[PDB]
Amino acid sequence: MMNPLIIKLGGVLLDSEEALERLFSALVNYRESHQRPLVIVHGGGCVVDELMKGLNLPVKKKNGLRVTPADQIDIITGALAGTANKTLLAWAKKHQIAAVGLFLGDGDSVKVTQLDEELGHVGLAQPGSPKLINSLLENGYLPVVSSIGVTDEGQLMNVNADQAATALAATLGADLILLSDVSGILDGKGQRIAEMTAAKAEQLIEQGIITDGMIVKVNAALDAARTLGRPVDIASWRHAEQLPALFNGMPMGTRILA
Template sequence: MEPLVIKLGGVLLDNEEALERLFTALQEYRQTHKRQLVIVHGGGCLVDELMQKLQLPVVKEQGLRVTPVDQIGIITGALAGIANKTLLSWATKYQLTSVGLYLGDGNVVTVSQLSEELGYVGKVMPGDAKLLRILLDAGYIPIISSIGVTDKGELMNVNADQAATAIAQTLGADLVLLSDVSGILDGKGQKIPDMTAQKAEQLIVQGIITDGMIVKVNAALDAAKTLGRPVDIASWRHADQLTALFNGVPVGTRILA
């Protein structure tokens, strides 16, 4: 099987029970399967908490965090520091051999500034798979934060869904976006089993898909189109379903290419 990129999102990083479920599932999966895994994470909830403590404003535009120059260092510390090392500590607890990275390591992706208005927010493109291949072939699980760097050496805050998409493109890997919800929900709160670009567009116009979910769906549609294969959006809440998900069985919403 191709490698699998697992993007962790939502409040997972701030929820011990959720981390326990996830890492139990990862441990069980690694004991019985040889599929190579890469974890990509953001940590918006940690950043929001930190901003609140520091009494700094949190501004988002269409689900993307506006990142002024006086905040990029704080956000880097939260994502590449606290969030990344928290996940590495859980991996250690569950005997999973892992290594912590950020998007600039080994040029695994390339990052440029998305727009002046958003500040230090990066646009991400596929990069060089060499470092990840070395680590995966040696049995490591790379755990990668969504902080990147431009060719001018400027740190950038990258949307984690988009970062995971670019890494999947770099590796030619499958992609799963794990979030708080069991998939994309319709107007009645029911899970939609599969999603096309046309259906997504309709739901955005109707106001059913909003804010951060628009970014998530667009990232998944983009990845599915680029990779030429489906991308899954699913929940980390159901540990019993995660092994099936890691094996390519859809348990949430499957985004079709």
Template sequence: MDKPTLVIKLGGALIENDEALTALFATLKTFLDEQPRPLVLVHGGGCLVDDLLKGLGLTSSKKNGLRVTPFEQIPYIAGALAGTANKQMMAKAIATGIASVGLCLADGGLCQVTQLDPELGAVGDCQPGNPALLNGILSQGFLPVVSSIGITAGGQLMNVNADQAATAIAEALGADLVMLSDVSGILDGKGKLVPQLDQLTALDLMEKGVIKDGMAVKVQAALHAAQTLGKPVCVASWRYPDQLLALLAGGVVGTLVTATATV
């Protein structure tokens, strides 16, 4: 494989936007047809989880941007993420003519998952594992679609933040990493796009409360990945297929997150 694998993290809100999801997979198909490159999709599905829990009469809360996951709720959350969300992504890939394989973080030992914090319940800390299965799937020309459900060594299902999951997979593969969400990138206190973000600037924006909650989790994961991978991580939007095509081809879109400041 000449070009490095590209891991693309897709924000959960995308799954509920059929038009945007269709446009995204059409863009991926165009790219794969014109200039093939190994791609891995990693997704969450927070909106689906919210809808399911609400329908079941269950409440849900977040702590520091991470969903508190009582152990009695993890079967439902796993069903929403590794089941419904994953298969909806697969369905869209198939309808677009992209050969794909649906996975979770545990398949082939792709990621090593442990409990992150007892106060969060069944929420997992995700570390790179064995990429052999994923590399085998990629070598056969398939698009892996990976949900952010992990399993501990003891067999406990865990809900893993999708940004952190994508980071661990990119580290396992030595891949490039792009995080796509419903915003154009990371924004400053005035709502303007920050074209490049290093650790010092990120910490400053976090201390000021500009970067917080889920975006803080995303930025921390991107900084960690940039440091571990030794290359920038892109945070951009899935809303603009033309920009995505440029990004897939190596262009600069959204915010580039770097481990250290560049002179």
């Protein structure tokens, strides 16, 4: 047996039926040979933005962060905790996987407080109780956890999915992979770097090699690893066939140590 693995799924992946079919095929392949408890954590992003578009609701920001007013946390919760979550559960059912949909508040898995009065219903994640998810994992279910949470007072909160996944990893003593569009960082010679310290990450950045949104992806993993105290992997679905090895603990993307 092994400690659990949290696979966090980013926006672009959820928007792509190709990526989803490759992911769930990968999950089936891995599960045929491997025993490790797996947990999925997901955001939404696109499905939320699509729905705000359709409702002609403006998506505002304060200092580079989203704002979820009282009067739209319910819509956002619908898109994320409902649509995105159940879409994943439908994929699981199609592929014969016994999944169970959760949000952060189920079993107080991840505790959430209000980040900032000015941002409204945006939550800050912290580790919660592992009891519920441990018992689901013990009984052979694959928990699929959305990044909506709830405060102890009963207020719904939209939580950054990377930070939610980090909190849940801490809660369960789990390893963490952040799956998205980046398959792995390459050095100044176009060679995948299998393992990267904070120091080489910081060098590689404004040495000019790590640029654009990749800065944000690497910084997200560094933040997660800094918190967790064990490494966090960045990977993509690109090489479907390597995902099972990735899930088994091999650094097939880029492993961040911080």
